[PDB]
Structure formats: C-alpha cells, structure tokens
C-alpha cells in the first residue's frame, strides 16, 4: 500500500526529464521480422510491436483468474521498451492486491 509513491518518484526522475530522454531516443531501432527471426522473447518484443506473451495465452496455475493488462510501447527503440517496465510494475501491485482476497485455507 506504500509502493506506488516510490514508483511515482522515478517518474519525476526520468520520464519528464529531457536529457535522459535525449540520452535514449531512436537508439536500437530493431522492429522488422528479423526482430522475431532472431528469436527474441518479451520486452524487446511486444513493447516493440507484435502483441504476444506467455502470461494469458498459456496458463501456469491459478493465474488466469486475475485481471491485468500488458503494456505496449509505440516504436521499436529502447525508450519504447523502457516504458514497458514502468507499467509492468504498475501491474504487479494490482495482482498482489487481487491475489490476497482469494486464498483459501488448506494443505501444503
């Protein structure tokens, strides 16, 4: 309950800043079908384009019974695979705050 203030710190530290934005825009523009023929896994995927993940097309355990969304960035550079990770941490807080309400007592 006291973590989203800490992720709102780095938003002020890096997102709205210009120099770090100027330090990383249009660097590593790899977006073609050789960005998938190289056999990449996620981010340095879908945040560059092609929507696919192993987190709601393939189940693990009770993992589909929770609600969340998956981030997609705009172009195929590092700054649009950086902005996956800010929204990705804004998903794990929801899932933990969704998982605690649903645990039954039982065995190990």
């Amino acid at each position: 309950k006291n973590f989203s203030l800490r992720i709102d710190e780095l938003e002020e530290m890096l997102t709205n800043n210009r120099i770090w934005r100027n330090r990383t825009v249009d660097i590593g523009i790899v977006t073609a079908e050789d960005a998938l023929n190289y056999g990449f896994s996620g981010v340095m995927l879908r945040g560059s384009g092609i929507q696919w993940d192993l987190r709601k097309t393939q189940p693990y355990d009770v993992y589909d019974q929770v609600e969340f969304d998956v981030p997609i960035g705009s172009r195929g550079d590092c700054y649009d695979r950086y902005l996956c990770r800010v929204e990705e941490m804004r998903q794990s807080i929801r899932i933990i705050s969704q998982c605690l309400n649903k645990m039954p007592p039982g065995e190990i």
Partner: protein, 67 residues
Amino acid sequence: KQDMPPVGGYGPIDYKRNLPRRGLSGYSMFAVGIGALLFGYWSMMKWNRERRRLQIEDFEARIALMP
C-alpha cells in the same frame, strides 16, 4: 487451523500515475522575466549617471590645481 487469509481490511494502493502540480504556465511565464529585467535597467541611469556626476567631480580637482 491457524492459517492466514484475513476476513477484511484492504485498499488497494493505486496503479494511477499523475502529479500535475502546475505551476504558472501559459504566458504567465515570460512576464516575470521581462519586467524584472527592465527593473534592473531601471536601476541603471540613476547610478551610472550619478557616478558620471562624481566622475566630473573627480576630474574637477585635477584641473583646478596644476598651475
């Protein structure tokens, strides 16, 4: 029987992302800049011209003597 899951007491914290604390934008800026800048120029002409008055006063003592 002594397992975890509590009956109640939940938030959550937000997934939200906002802090628009602006901030005197939109032509309110450039207005405190120009007026205070000319205020510094307004502080001139009352000191340099004043020191210029003392500058002729300083050269006055040189010319009055030296015969």
